[PDB]
């Protein structure tokens, strides 16, 4: 890790607002999609 890095990497949490509803919803849409094909 030689070399002074330029940044203090923060946790990539930027869109913590990923409402479980819509997150799971898109998963279900993908799941139903793959099964039909």
């Amino acid at each position: 890790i030689s070399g002074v890095s330029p940044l203090l990497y923060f946790p990539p949490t930027t869109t913590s607002t990923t409402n479980r509803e819509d997150q799971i919803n898109k998963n279900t849409n993908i799941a139903i999609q793959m099964i039909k094909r």
């Binding site: 898109k26 998963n27 993908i30 799941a31 793959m34 099964i35």
Partner: protein, 57 residues
């Protein structure tokens, strides 16, 4: 009155036996045609993997 009745009476046992055997054969054929159909469905792990890829992770 005498002859045909006697010969019918003589016929009865063999016919009964053969018909019982035939019914048993029908039941055996009915049983032999039964098979359980085990189906295979797409594993959900692949679906989860596709979901991860779509996230650009």
């Amino acid at each position: 009155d005498i002859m045909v009745p006697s010969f019918v009476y003589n016929k009865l046992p063999v016919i009964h036996f053969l018909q019982e055997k035939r019914a048993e054969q029908k039941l055996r054929r009915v049983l032999d045609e039964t098979y359980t159909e085990w189906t295979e469905e797409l594993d959900q792990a692949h679906v989860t993997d596709a979901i991860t890829r779509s996230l650009n992770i």
